[PDB]
Design an enzyme around this catalytic site. Structure first.
Site, PDB file in Angstrom:
ATOM      1  N   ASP A  16      -6.312   8.340  -0.646  1.00 33.22           N
ATOM      2  CA  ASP A  16      -5.805   7.366   0.480  1.00 33.22           C
ATOM      3  C   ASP A  16      -4.706   7.935   1.067  1.00 33.22           C
ATOM      4  O   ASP A  16      -3.838   8.397   0.471  1.00 33.22           O
ATOM      5  CB  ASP A  16      -5.513   6.105  -0.070  1.00 33.22           C
ATOM      6  N   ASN A  62      -7.714   8.951  -5.826  1.00 32.14           N
ATOM      7  CA  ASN A  62      -8.763   8.019  -6.370  1.00 32.14           C
ATOM      8  C   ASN A  62      -9.717   8.787  -7.294  1.00 32.14           C
ATOM      9  O   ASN A  62     -10.002   9.969  -7.073  1.00 32.14           O
ATOM     10  CB  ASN A  62      -9.559   7.277  -5.376  1.00 32.14           C
ATOM     11  N   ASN A 111      -9.007   5.746   3.435  1.00 28.19           N
ATOM     12  CA  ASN A 111      -9.638   6.464   2.595  1.00 28.19           C
ATOM     13  C   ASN A 111     -10.317   7.466   3.041  1.00 28.19           C
ATOM     14  O   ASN A 111     -11.064   7.275   4.005  1.00 28.19           O
ATOM     15  CB  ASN A 111     -10.654   5.537   1.822  1.00 28.19           C
ATOM     16  N   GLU A 171       0.825  -1.006  -0.153  1.00 31.43           N
ATOM     17  CA  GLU A 171      -0.183  -0.113   0.017  1.00 31.43           C
ATOM     18  C   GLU A 171       0.952   1.279  -0.255  1.00 31.43           C
ATOM     19  O   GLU A 171       0.637   2.161  -0.782  1.00 31.43           O
ATOM     20  CB  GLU A 171      -1.025   0.003   1.318  1.00 31.43           C
ATOM     21  N   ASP A 176     -12.973   8.699  -7.492  1.00 35.58           N
ATOM     22  CA  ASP A 176     -14.423   9.272  -6.977  1.00 35.58           C
ATOM     23  C   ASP A 176     -13.834  10.774  -6.297  1.00 35.58           C
ATOM     24  O   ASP A 176     -14.805  11.102  -5.478  1.00 35.58           O
ATOM     25  CB  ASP A 176     -15.053   8.141  -6.132  1.00 35.58           C
ATOM     26  N   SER A 221     -12.008  10.958  -3.668  1.00 36.46           N
ATOM     27  CA  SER A 221     -11.154  10.859  -2.287  1.00 36.46           C
ATOM     28  C   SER A 221      -9.771  10.611  -2.660  1.00 36.46           C
ATOM     29  O   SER A 221      -9.323  10.331  -3.613  1.00 36.46           O
ATOM     30  CB  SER A 221     -11.995   9.311  -1.764  1.00 36.46           C
TER      31      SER A 221
END
Length: 128
Positions: free
Chosen positions: A52, A46, A59, A35, A48, A50
């Site tokens: 991370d 991301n 998130n 990650e 959408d 958002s």
């Protein structure tokens, strides 16, 4: 902070991730490796809208607040920036709630694709 492998293992164990929800410690170290490459300051946007955050790439739609994410629920009741700190306490506290939510560690795409079903205890080999 960029953690060493065994350093991170020891910290995750201290904070109670070893076999948390049945997941052995190597799952968590492997998850962090892929990650975030063990870097607490990692961030990634991301589609959408958002982002991370942190060593476990938590998130901003569901878990932490970053102030710019539509649909934010902030279920860990934490600013996303707290998830970037050298101290991994907030990330671990939030990851414990995530892994408890229904899908277990499958919430972590890099774990699902690179750790799940592998010999994850290799990630703590060598460590004391």
């Amino acid at each position: 902070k960029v953690f060493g492998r065994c350093e991170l293992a020891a910290a995750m164990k201290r904070h109670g991730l070893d076999n948390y929800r049945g997941y052995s410690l190597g799952n968590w170290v492997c998850a962090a490796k892929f990650e975030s490459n063990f870097n607490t300051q990692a961030t990634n946007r991301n589609t959408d809208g958002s982002t991370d955050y942190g060593i476990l790439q938590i998130n901003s739609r569901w878990w932490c607040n970053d102030g710019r994410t539509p649909g934010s629920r902030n279920l860990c009741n934490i600013p996303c920036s707290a998830l970037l700190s050298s101290d991994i306490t907030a990330s671990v506290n939030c990851a414990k709630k995530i892994v408890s939510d229904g899908n277990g560690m499958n919430a972590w795409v890099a774990w699902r694709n690179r750790c799940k079903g592998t010999d994850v205890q290799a990630w703590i080999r060598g460590c004391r």
